[PDB]
Amino acid sequence: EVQKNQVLTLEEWQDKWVNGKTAFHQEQGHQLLKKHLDTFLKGKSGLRVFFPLCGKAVEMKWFADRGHSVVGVEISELGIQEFFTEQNLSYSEEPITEIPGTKVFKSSSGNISLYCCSIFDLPRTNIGKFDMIWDRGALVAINPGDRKCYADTMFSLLGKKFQYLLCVLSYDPTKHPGPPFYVPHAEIERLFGKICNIRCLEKVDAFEERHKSWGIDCLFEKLYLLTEK
Ligand SMILES: Nc1ncnc2c1ncn2[C@@H]1O[C@H](CSCC[C@H](N)C(=O)O)[C@@H](O)[C@H]1O
């Protein structure tokens, strides 16, 4: 409960993009996902995959290239345009009618749609249900107090059977206030334990030189696989 009162605003996240402060972005993609990708998609085709707080995650293309439909939500229009530019994809726009002033960016390929609004606006849209969710730099970027609402929101997006892939970071919360925030095993059990079977697939050192700016000297990444209980 040390970071419990941290409250970031959407304007602050949008400013990080405008100012180029996006060190969370991994150009080569998540290595743990890469390792387990073939197993998670074994025997499946044409899945609908959701990427909350997607930024310009290259992993979205990995799924689209394998025949799966991808939907993401990101508050920064700049981040979304950077995704299309870097993946060399053309796109067109459409209004999100239920949330005046916002838009959804759709690739010409028809395989990727990026909603440019808040994840908390989604329940009021017709985004529908998903077979799979890839959550990295998402549950851990959400204001601590908003996590229960975030979890409830995610559940309303899931189909009967699903695979919720979740990445969280393990570090001493008294040394760095976040983001990304500290989401311990207990918090995952509190937020998802009633509805999901929880499996911790991997735990690996993720400390990089850039992390010294956080004031920590230790950093571990854990990959969880949550499925219908
Ligand atoms: N409430 C909210 N709704 C939608 N997007 C949000 C949001 N709060 C933060 N974001 C966006 O959340 C992202 C978190 S960092 C994103 C990283 C991306 N998932 C990756 O793995 O590289 C930022 O791009 C930020 O602009």
From Swiss-Prot:
The pH note for this entry is: Optimum pH is 7.5.
The record ties this protein, via SUPFAM superfamilies, to:
S-adenosyl-L-methionine-dependent methyltransferases
| A GO molecular-function descriptor | thiopurine S-methyltransferase activity
Phenotype when changing residue 199 to H = Allele TPMT*8; intermediate activity
- Which PROSITE patterns does its entry note? SAM_MT_TPMT
GO BP terms: methylation; nucleobase-containing compound metabolic process; xenobiotic catabolic process; xenobiotic metabolic process
Spell out which residues are annotated as carrying N6-acetyllysine.
Answer: 42
Result when mutating residue 33 to S = Allele TPMT*5; has very low activity when expressed in a heterologous system
Matching entries from PANTHER family are given as: THIOPURINE S-METHYLTRANSFERASE
Q: What protein name applies here?
A: Thiopurine S-methyltransferase
Naturally occurring in which organism (per UniProt): Homo sapiens
